[PDB]
Amino acid sequence: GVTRNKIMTAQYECYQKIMQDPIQQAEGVYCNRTWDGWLCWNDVAAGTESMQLCPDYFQDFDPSEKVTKICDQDGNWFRHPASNRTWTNYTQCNVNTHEKVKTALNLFYLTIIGHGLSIASLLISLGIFFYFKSLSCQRITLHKNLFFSFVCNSVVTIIHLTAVANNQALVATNPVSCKVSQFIHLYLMGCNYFWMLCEGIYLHTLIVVAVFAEKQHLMWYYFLGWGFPLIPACIHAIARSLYYNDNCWISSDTHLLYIIHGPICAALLVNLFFLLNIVRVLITKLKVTNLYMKAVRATLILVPLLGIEFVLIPEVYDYIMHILMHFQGLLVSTIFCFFNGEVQAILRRNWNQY
Amino acid sequence: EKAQREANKKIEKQLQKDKQVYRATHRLLLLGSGIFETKFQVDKVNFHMFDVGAQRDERRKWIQCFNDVTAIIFVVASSQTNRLQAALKLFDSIWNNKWLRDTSVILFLNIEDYFPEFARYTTPEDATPEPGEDPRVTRAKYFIRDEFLRISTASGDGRHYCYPHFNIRRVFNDCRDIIQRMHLRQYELL
Amino acid sequence: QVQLQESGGGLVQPGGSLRLSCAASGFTFSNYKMNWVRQAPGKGLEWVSDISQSGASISYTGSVKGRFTISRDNAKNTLYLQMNSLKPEDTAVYYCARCPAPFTRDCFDVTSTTYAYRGQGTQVTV
Amino acid sequence: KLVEQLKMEANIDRIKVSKAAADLMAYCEAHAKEDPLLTPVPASENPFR
Amino acid sequence: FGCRFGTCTVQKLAHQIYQFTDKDKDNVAPRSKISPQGY
Amino acid sequence: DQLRQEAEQLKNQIRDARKACADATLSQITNNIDPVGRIQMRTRRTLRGHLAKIYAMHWGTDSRLLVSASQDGKLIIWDSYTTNKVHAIPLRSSWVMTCAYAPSGNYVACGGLDNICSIYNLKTREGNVRVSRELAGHTGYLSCCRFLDDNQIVTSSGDTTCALWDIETGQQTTTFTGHTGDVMSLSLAPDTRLFVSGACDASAKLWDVREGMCRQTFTGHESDINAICFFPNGNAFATGSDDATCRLFDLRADQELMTYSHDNIICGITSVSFSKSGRLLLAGYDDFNCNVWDALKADRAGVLAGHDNRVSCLGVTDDGMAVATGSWDSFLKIWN
Amino acid sequence: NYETAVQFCWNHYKDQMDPIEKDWCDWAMISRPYSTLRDCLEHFAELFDLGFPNPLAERIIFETHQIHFANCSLVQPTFSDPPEDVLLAMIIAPICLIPFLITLVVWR
C-alpha cells in the first residue's frame, strides 16, 4: 500500500526536479532528464550506462543492488532491439535481495542469542565479584567496570535492535526518544572498547612499566572508560543533525559513523601494542628456569579481554567473526570469572557448604 | 551512639593512609633486640630488610612469620663442621615448607672431603668467568650453584623462585622480577 | 612419649663394619621422615643421612655416600644405618633423629642443639 | 638435674580416670543449658543478628 | 562506501534489518518492465 | 654420672602409676550420652581493615570489645556489635605474634619476635593511647601473653621459658623453666592460681603461678603443641599439635583422657578454645577451616568453613555468645 | 484510439484537479489524481505496446506542472554527506586527543 504512495511521490519528485532547475550547463549530445518508471533519470551523458542503487520500494528489489540503465548516443535512451523499448535491466535488485535477507535474519538471531548469553554470564560474574569481597583488588575493580560496560552495551543494543531497528512504526514516527536510544547506544559501544583500553593500560603499567606496587590513583581510568566516550557521541549527534539527519539516524551510509568507530580503532591498535609488549615480557620470563604452547595460551587468554578479536582477522569467515565479536562478554566472563584459578578454588571450597 | 561513627571514620581514614605506606614497602628476610630492621631505598622504592637475631637455632615456628615477604635473602657460608651441607639442608627445608612454597629465595653465595663428586666435576663451558680468577674457585662456585639448583629445580608445585648469584641492585632487580612474575600469575598468564 | 632409643656400635678397627639400630616408640613410624645425624668429638652436630616415609627417596652427606646405607622397617618401626669401610674420621656420637611434623618433605631443626625428638646416641669409635 | 622434678611428680595422688571423666561429664551436663553455641538462643536477644 | 571495519557491523546490520522488513514491499514485479522490454 | 637408668625407671614407675589409675576410657563412660547433632554456625560479622595476616585476637570481659593483632604493625579494638573500630594502635615492631586484652579493659599487651611485651594504656587523659610499659627480659620471641590483673602479666617465650611480671616496676617476678622447646601457648586457669603451657617438645606443663615449680607434665602428643586451653571447669585442658590431633588431658588423672583425630585430617592445629559449657571443642586447622568437636563423644559436630587462608587464632566470648576466628586472610569473622 | 482515451483521461484529471488550487503543491491529498493519471497512462501504453517514458508523458507532465505545479518549493536533502575535509577533521579530532589521556593515566 505505502509502496504505491512512495512511487507516486517519486514520480512527483522527478516532475519537481525537472520543473525546478532546467538549467543544464552541459547541453551537448546527451539524454535528458526523465523518469523511467521507478527512478528519476536526470540529465546524464549519452553512450554511458547510468547505473544507480535500486530503490527500497519492492521486497525482491534490494537497495544495495544497483540497476543498469543506458541512454544511447542519439540523444535518447538506449532502445532494446526486441520491443523498441528503453533497455533497462532491473533483475539484479530482485536477485540480490532474496539471498541477502536469509543471511541477515540469521545474523540478527545470532546477535540476540550472543548478547543474551553475554548478559547472563557477565551478570553472574558481577554477582560473584560483588558478593565474595575476598577478591578485591584494583584489577578486580577494573574488571567490574568492564563487565558493567559490557552488560550496559549489550542491554542497550538489544533494546535498540529489536524495538527501534525492527519497528517501522517507530522509525516512521522518528521521535527524539529513538534518536537518543541510538545516541546512548553509540556512547556505550564506545565505552566498551575504551574500558578494554583501560584494562590494557592497567596490564601494561602493572607488568611492563612501573611494575612496583604504587597503588595507582584509579581516578583517570574512570574518566577514560566512562567520560571520554561522551565526546565523540555528542560530536556525532550534532554533526549528524547538521549534515545527514534522517530516519532517526537508522541509515548507516554516512561517513559520520567514523566519528564513533574511528577512536575505537585507535583503542584497538594501542591494545594490540600493549598485548605485544605483555607477551614479549612473558616470553622473556619463560626463557629462564614451552615457548609455543604457553605463549599462545596467554595470547588467546588476553585477546578476549583486550578485544584484539577485530585485529585477530590476520561465508564462514564473516559468520565466525560475528560469533566471536558478539560472544565477547561470554568469553571474558568464562575466562576471568569461571576459569580464573582464584575464584575457581574459592568456589570449589565453598561449594561443599552452600 | 553516633560519636562512635565519626571515631570509626577517622580511624579508617588513618588506616587508608597507612595502607599506602604498607603496600609501598617491600619486606625482606635476611638469613645468614629480637629482630634488627633496616630501611633502605633504591630507585625511590623503600625496602625493609630484617635480620633476626637473639633467637634460638630452632626456626620451624617463627620462620612461618615470613611467608608474605617479597623474598628471603639466603647467604651461605663456605668461604669446620661442614657448613655448606647445613646450608643446603636449610635451603631444602625452606623450599619444601608448605608455608614458604610461595616465597621466593634470593641466594647469595658469599671441600672435596665433604663432597667427593667435586673431585670428578667439570666446569661447564657455558659459564661466565671473569678474568684473573683461579679455575679452582670458579669450579667450586659453579659446583655449589649446581648443588643448590639440584634442590631448587626438583620441585613439583609452589610459586617460589630461586635467584642464585655468584649488591643491593641485585636484590632490587630480583624483587622487581618477583613482582612481575606475581602480577603475571595473577592474570593466569604464567 | 617420643623415645627414639638407638643401639649398636662399639670400637671396631678401621675399615670394619657396624649396623646401628634405632627402635622408635611413641608415634607412627611410617608418617615421619627419619634422619641419622652425628656429633664428632669437639665439633658441632652434622647431618649424615635421611630416609622418607615409604623409603624410596634416600640421601646421604658426601663423605658417607657409597659407604653407609640407611634402611627403615615400618613393620618393626626401626631405623638401620649399615656402615662399612669405616674411616678414622667416623668416630662420633650417632643420633637417630626424627622430623618434627608428619607428612612433610621439609625437615627443620634437626642438627640443632637442644632439639627434641632425638635419641641419646651411640658412641661409634674406630 | 631433672630427676628431682620427676620425684616431685611421683608423690602426687592420682584419682581414677572413671571418677575424673564422670566429674567432667557432670560439669558439662550441669552447665549445658546456658551455652548459646549448642542451644541456639532466639534472634530477638542475639546481639549479632 | 560506508564502513569497512569489523565494529560497524552492528550499525549496517540495523541499517539492513529495517529496510528488509517492509510491510508495503512487494516482491512481485512485472516481467515486462523487469526485462529490457519495459520500464 | 650415669643415673639415666634411674631417670628411665622413674618415668616407668610414673607410667605404671598412670596405668593403675586408668579404669577405662572417656568413650566407655560417654558412650550412652546423646550427641549434640549437626552444629551449623553462620558468619554473623566479618571485621575488615587489617592489611596483613592476623596472628592473634582476644575478647574483652564484656564480650563486645575484641583486640586483634596483625603483622602490618596495627593493634585494632573492634566493637563486635556494630563492627566499628574503637581503636587502632600502631606498633613499633610489626611482628606481633600475641595480643592480650586486660580483664578490666584498661590495658592491652602485645608482643612477638621482638622479645618485648608492650603494655598500652587505653583509658588515658590525653585521649590517645600510648606505650605504658615495655617488659624486656626474654631471649626469644613472645608466643603468648595473658593478664592476671592490671598489675601482673604472664608471658611465654621461644626461649623455653615462661615469666610472671610486675607491670608497675617492670621486672620479672617469677621465672618458670623446665620446657625443652619453644613454649607456643599458655592458658590461665579460671581461678588463675595455675596456668598450663604447651611447648614444641610435645609436652604440656602445669605451673603454680605463686611459686616457681612445675606441678605436672603431660605427654602423649607426637609433635609440637601449638595451642592449649583450660576446660571451663578448670580441672582439664586440651592441646592441639602438628600431628593433626587434639588431646584432652585431665589434671587430677595426670594422663590424657580423649583424642580427637580423623584419618582425612592431616593438617596441624593452630588454635583451640572450648565453648562456655565445655561440651564443644573448637579447633582451627591449616586446611583453612575450623572443626567443632564433641568434647565428650570425640565425634565431629560441625565445621566452620568460611576462611580462605590458615586460621591463625580462635576465641570464644566469656558468655559463650560468639566465636571470633582470625586468619592469614586478614579478616576476623564472628560466628554464632 | 489511444488518443481518445488519453484526452478523456486528461479531462477527468483536470476536472478532479480544478478545486485543488489551494493545495496545488500538496502531494499528500493530491496523490489520488496523480496515481489515477499514472495508472491511466500505463493502461494506454500497455494496450498499444507503447514505451515509457514517451513524448506524450513529457507533454502531460509539462501541462500538469506549468499550470498546476509551477509554484512548488520543497527541498529536504537529509541524505546529504558532510564536507569531506570537515568529515575527516571531525573523525580524527577525538583520535588526536586519546594519546594525551592515555599518557595522563599512565603517569598519573
By CA distance, what is A237's nearest residue in G?
G90
Query: Residue F142: which H helix or E strand, with range?
Result: strand F142-147
Listed residues A89, A111, A130: the one ending a domain: A89
Mutate to test the interface with F, among B9, B10, B17, B33 (most CBs of F within 10 A): B33
Please calculate the CA angle A75-A81-A84 and round it to the nearest 5 degrees.
65
Burial class (CB in 10 A: 0-12, 13-18, 19+), D29: middle
Q: Which residue has the cell 572498547?
A: A193
Query: Is the sign of the CA dihedral F71, F74, F79, F81 positive or negative?
Result: negative
Tell which F residues from 247 to 286 touch D, by Cβ distance under 8 Å. 250, 252-255, 257, 275-280
Roughly what angle, to the nearest 10 degrees, separates helices B168-186 and A176-207?
A: 140
For D39, residues 6+ apart whose C-beta sits below 8 A from its C-beta are D32, D33
Q: Are strands B104-108 and B162-165 parallel, antiparallel or unpaired?
A: parallel
Q: Hey, is the C-beta of F294 within 8 angstroms of any chain A C-beta?
A: no
Provide the grid cell at E1.
Answer: 562506501
Cell of C29: 613410624
Nearest to G37 by CA among G70, G69, G73, G80: G69
Mutate to test the interface with A, among F308, F309, F330 (most CBs of A within 10 A): F308
Q: Of A26, A57, A89, at which residue does a domain stop? A: A89
Distance CA(A57)–CA(A55), nearest Å, equals 6
Q: Which of A164, A129, A134, A135 is nearest to A147 (CA)?
A: A129
Does residue A217 sit at the G interface (CB-CB below 8 Å)? yes
Distance of CA G104 to the CA centre of its chain: 53
| C-alpha to C-alpha distances, A68 to A51, A56, A138, G26, nearest whole angstrom | 5, 16, 60, 32
Q: Do chains G and D touch (3 or more CB pairs under 8 A)?
A: no
Cβ pair A237, A167 in contact under 8 A: no
Domain ranges in chain B are 25-186
Distance CA B167, CA F319 (A): 57
Task: Provide long-range contacts, Cβ within 8 A and 24+ apart, for B16-25.
Answer: B18/F51, B18/F72, B18/F74, B18/F90, B19/A215, B19/F51, B20/A215, B22/F51, B22/F52, B22/F72, B23/A213, B23/A215, B23/F51, B24/A213, B24/A214, B24/A215
Q: How many CB pairs under 8 A join A and E?
A: 135
- CATH number where A85 lies: 4.10.1240.10
Residue A318, number of CB atoms within 10 A of its CB: 12
**How many CB atoms lie under 10 A from the CB of residue C105?**
17
Residue of A6, A32, A34, A252 to mutate, interface with G, max G Cβ within 10 Å:
A34
Q: Solved by what technique? A: cryo-EM
Both ends of chain F: CA-CA distance in Å?
59
* Class of residue A271 by CB neighbours under 10 A (exposed 0-12, middle 13-18, buried 19+): buried
**What is the domain range of residue C101?**
1-126
Residue C125 DSSP label: B
What is the number of structural domains in chain A?
2
Give, as one character, the DSSP assignment of residue F61.
T
CB contact under 8 A, A166 and E17: yes
CATH architecture of D1-49: Irregular (4.10)
* CATH code of the domain covering residue A302: 1.20.1070.10
Across the interface, which of F303, F305, F329 has its CB nearest the CB of A134? F329
Q: Which three cell numbers stand for residue B122?
A: 667439570
Q: Is residue A22 located within the same domain as residue A138?
A: no
Edge-first strand order for the sheet with C78-84 is C5-7, C17-23, C78-84, C68-73
Query: How many structural domains comprise chain C?
Result: 1
Q: What angle do CA F65, F67, F71 make, to 5 degrees?
A: 160
Q: Do C111 and B86 count as a contact with CB atoms less than 8 A apart?
A: yes
Cell representation of residue F246: 587434639
Contact C86, C66 (CB under 8 A): no
The kind and range of the H/E element at F333 are strand F332-335
Q: Is F44–D48 a contact, with Cβ atoms under 8 angstroms apart? A: yes
Q: Are A70 and E33 in contact (CB under 8 A)?
A: no
- F329 min Cα distance to partner chain A (Å): 9
CB burial string C14-36: b at 16+ within 10 A, e below:
eeeebebbbbbebbebebbbbbb
A352 CB neighbours in chain F (<8 A) are 305
What is the C-alpha separation between D32 and F32, in angstroms, rounded? 17
Asked if A134 and F288 come within 8 Å (Cβ–Cβ), the reply is: no
What does the buried/exposed string (b/e) look like for F303-335 if buried means 16 or more CB atoms within 10 Å of the residue's CB?
bbbbbbebbbbbbbbeebbbbbbbbbbbbbbbb
**CB distance E8–A257 less than 8 Å?**
yes
Residue range(s) defining the domain that contains residue E6: 1-39
Compare all CA atoms of chain B with the CA of F72 and give the residue at the minimum distance: B22
Question: Would you say A111 and E10 are in contact if contact means Cβ atoms under 8 Å apart?
Answer: yes
CA distance to partner chain F, nearest, from residue D19 (Å): 9
d(CA A76, CA A70): 9
Cell numbers of F247, please?
588431646
Residues 6+ apart with CB under 8 A from C93: C38, C39, C121, C122, C123, C124
Q: How far apart are CA A207 and CA B176, in angstroms?
A: 10
Report the gap between the CA of E32 and the closest CA in chain G (Å).
Answer: 10
Q: How many CB atoms lie within 10 A of CB F189?
A: 19
What is the per-residue DSSP string for chain B? --HHHHHHHHHHHHHHHHHHHHHHEEEEEEE---SEEEEEEETTEEEEEEE--S--S--TTTGGGGSSSSEEEEE-------HHHHHHHHHHHHHH-SSSTTSEEEEE---TTT-GGGGG----TT--PPSS--HHHHHHHHHHHHHHHHHHTS--S-S--EEEE--HHHHHHHHHHHHHHHHHHHTT--
Instruction: Quote the CA–CA distance of A79 and A63 in Å, as a whole number.
Output: 25
Backbone CA torsion sign across A228, A233, A234, A236:
positive
Say if the Cβ atoms of D37 and F278 lie within 8 Å. no
Question: Measured between CB atoms, does E5 come within 8 Å of chain G?
Answer: no
DSSP designation for G78: -
Residues A241 and A301 in one domain: yes
8 A C-beta contact, residue C90 and residue C81: no
Angstroms from E32 CA to nearest CA on chain A: 10
Q: Which residues pair with C18 in a beta bridge?
A: C83
Q: Looking at chain B, which residue has its C-alpha nearest residue F51?
A: B19
Cβ–Cβ contact B190 with A under 8 A: yes
- Which residue of chain C comes nearest to B59, CA vs CA? C109
Rounded distance between C-alpha atoms, residue B50 and residue B38, angstroms: 6
Q: Which range marks the domain in which residue A42 is found? A: 2-89
Count A/B contacts: CB-CB distance under 8 Å: 44
Q: How close A133 gets to chain E, by Cα (Å)?
A: 35
Q: In the CATH hierarchy, which top-level class contains the domain F1-336?
A: mainly beta
Alpha-carbon distances, residue F37 vs A64, C109, D38, F103, F300 (angstroms): 75, 42, 9, 34, 9
**Which residue, F231, F106, F117, is CA-closest to F165?**
F117
Which residue segments constitute the domains of chain G, with CATH numbers given?
A: 2-66 (1.10.150.510)
Residue among D5, D20, D28 minimizing CB distance to F277: D28
CA distance F200 to chain C (A): 8
Is A100 within 8 Å of E11 when comparing Cβ atoms?
no
The verdict on A237 and A263 lying in the same domain is: yes
Closest of F50, F145, F65 to residue F104, by C-alpha = F65
Which residues of chain F from 231 to 290 reach within 8 Å of chain A, CB to CB? 288
Other beta carbons less than 10 A from residue F23's beta carbon: 14
- Count of alpha carbons within 13 angstroms of residue E36, beta-carbon side: 16
Residue B79 has a CB neighbour count (10 Å cut-off) of 12
Q: Which residues 83-102 of chain C have a CB within 8 Å of chain B?
A: 100-101
F211/D contact by beta carbon, under 8 A:
no
Please say whether the beta carbons of F119 and B33 come within 8 A.
no
CATH number assigned to the domain covering B25-186: 3.40.50.300
A62, A96 contact by CB (below 8 A): yes
Q: Which residue of A has its CA nearest to F306?
A: A350
Interchain CB contact of A6 with E (< 8 Å): yes
For chain F, how many residues are written? 336
